[PDB]
Symmetry: C5
Subunit: 206 residues, 5 copies
């Protein structure tokens, strides 16, 4: 349990061996979640990259937030993908929150505190809770099989996860700053293991 | 009967089966009206879609607010249409207010609190009081004959209707969300029925 | 003799029969004038139109403010024309003031409270006192001979006229909504006759 | 000497006969100077024009501030020219200050209170003190030989000249019109002669 | 040892002979550093130029901050270059800070107080302490071999340097004007030699 407040993980160049493994108190399967995080990369007009990679022993893409060049954000749950298209890239750090709810299939995707349209994905599914949660690489197997062509080059931080859907008022707090207590991954009480070329530095964003 | 304040209807996937039917205490046929609503969709550069479908047994397009692909807003009263061309799509929630007065034929169309020029439509006509008012689908018959290629995919809310023409000052109060009470459809006391895949969630816009 | 404060004339369709004639209490030969007004039309990228038409029995274009397609504002006194070119159309209400002085020939043209450069027109000329002053149409004879393809379609209001050139401070006050006292035509004590399809409605601009 | 505060000279049409001669109480040659002024013209895309023409018996362009069509501002000392190119023309009144110091050759050119990069011209030169200073026309001889295709059509005023280089703090005050006391030409104590069609009117700029 | 507060160096013309050489008693090789400065030039869309050139006998580009036309900022440590692409030039003074740490190889580049992505250069290297630190020219040997085609034309000032990586809050303090004390180069106690056409003038930036 380490407090990572105001610090981010830095992956300064492309590799297939640099990653952070985040440990969640494994539990019953999830019927809903929210994941929020900050990241900052120049890779967006060049190639695609994984932002957050959650795999189970039986599904490598159990939850995957990904940037796909010439498209925009890619969001996948239990192997099924949906797109949130982005016509202009930002040259600045980005905050995202994304959520999924089994009962409705609704996915929300929030970029710098502003919502995309609601979309539909994997209504009725359950997300497994024996997970391998990885920052900086895209998993093709449980805890492994990374591709350098999907590695994250740049900074990522403030990764928090909850097992329910945050309301728009709660998102606004996470984006602007205020008190909250994530119950799956908490940045202020983070259990993690680093591997390869990854550094811990003061965050570049407010 | 339900205060829908801060909530919206969500239509997360294309279909011809998902809709909301709004119930008005309607008695007197209409010689004037104002409709205002907020909606959020990414469909605008892909296809046309219906925003507000008001149908009677004599005229399926008695009041129709529609987005026409590569044209802009389409406004229909008693089967006759007028266009408000839009050169550039805004991809963000939009507030619209539209009004018609039979005496002059004057139509107004307001987008995010800004007026379009006044136009003329159906001077002398009377709009039927026995109506089916639908969100999410376009009616080709009283309460039905929907076409999936005209469904709204996204969120709609703050739907309000009056049986007279709001003044520019009153429109501004609606847009900034000051106190009002509509006399045909009131979002703060709405009676409605839901069909198919539609959800009620906290509104995405402020 | 009517206070038109906060109201505008609406000309919702193309025609050669809808117009307003304004009556000055006057008849003194003009050695100078200023004309101010607000108007709102969506015609500007499609065709030309008359904005303010002042005719005497000797000269149909005695004072003429006109929009000419692909050029911009055309301003004529005593049948002689000067242009104030406009590269990009504003699709929003516009406020204009224009003035002329016989002694110097100096013309000013102010758009949304901002001055165009001073130009020269008809130095030494006298503008006739007995006039037909028309809104909505362009006159080719005293009080008539209108051309439908040059009709104003949209709203016009706040029309005022003085028999001297307003200073830049005075125009700034008129634009910003301060106090002023027109001595030829006064929108707050307006004597007029309407013909054809013209309506009086709350103004759309603040 | 008259106080011309709040007034500007107006040259309403092209000519080669309209100009204003400004009288400086000059004696000792100049080893530095600053000239500031406001001007407003719409000529900038169709031809060049003189802004401030200072001539000596031995040199017609002893100091010349000129607008070169398709280039931007042209600044000359003792017949040697430097350019401050302008990619996009502003169609609004402009305030300029420009300075030159013989000890360094450094030229400054400020446009609407913002400094261009410093440049180099005529280091060690001395500027003649028996001068003909004209507005409205470009001198090819001491007090004459004007070219109509180089005449200023528009307004000019707030013309002030010191025999030293103003500091950045002082320019900011001259742009803000805080207090200042020029020692060569003082718009508040101006001695001048007019010729041809030039008018004095209240300034268009605030 | 001069207090340069509120002054800048001015290089008014392109040459290969105008430069400033900054002196300080550095003894310890550098395992980290930060440099900050203001500069202002109009060269950016015409050609490349050197902003801060730090050479050792071993390496002419030991630390080099450089502008490359049609590309952006170039940052070099020990002859190894990284780019920070800039597609739209800022035609105004700019403040930059740049830092490197040997332990991680992480480089930071901040423009007008906002950070670029973190990149990687020369992990494990050491920057030599016996240096030639030049403004105004780019070094191809220890203290010389200047190329006029890489000369800086414009102003530079507020040059400071430290032997450690400034944190984000420390950069804020510098950019926003708070008191600070640098430990390698200090604008308030600057020792230097100058050759050629270089002037000291009041700074053009705040
Ligand atoms: Ca995978
Ligand atoms: Ca993969
Ligand atoms: Ca229909
Ligand atoms: Ca249909
Ligand atoms: Ca005509
Ligand atoms: Ca006519
Ligand atoms: Ca000359
Ligand atoms: Ca000449
Ligand atoms: Ca070199
Ligand atoms: Ca070189
Ligand atoms: Zn944040």
């Amino acid at each position: 349990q380490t407090d990572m407040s105001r610090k981010a993980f830095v992956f300064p160049k492309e590799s297939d061996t640099s990653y952070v493994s985040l440990k969640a108190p494994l539990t019953k399967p999830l019927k809903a979640f929210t994941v929020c995080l900050h990241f900052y990369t120049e890779l967006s007009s060049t190639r695609g990259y994984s932002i957050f990679s959650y795999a189970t022993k039986r599904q490598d893409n159990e939850i995957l937030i990904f940037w796909s060049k010439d498209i925009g954000y890619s969001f996948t749950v239990g192997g099924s993908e949906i797109l949130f298209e982005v016509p202009e890239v930002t040259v600045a750090p980005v905050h995202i929150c994304t959520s999924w709810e089994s009962a409705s299939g609704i996915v929300e995707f929030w970029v710098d505190g502003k919502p995309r349209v609601r979309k539909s994905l994997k209504k009725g599914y359950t997300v497994g809770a024996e997970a391998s949660i990885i920052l900086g690489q895209e998993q093709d197997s449980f805890g492994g099989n990374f591709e350098g062509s999907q590695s994250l080059v740049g900074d990522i931080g403030n990764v928090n996860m909850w097992d329910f859907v945050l309301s728009p008022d709660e998102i606004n707090t996470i984006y602007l700053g205020g008190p909250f207590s994530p119950n799956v991954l908490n940045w202020r009480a983070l259990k993690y293991e680093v591997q390869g070329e990854v550094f811990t530095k003061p965050q570049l964003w407010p």
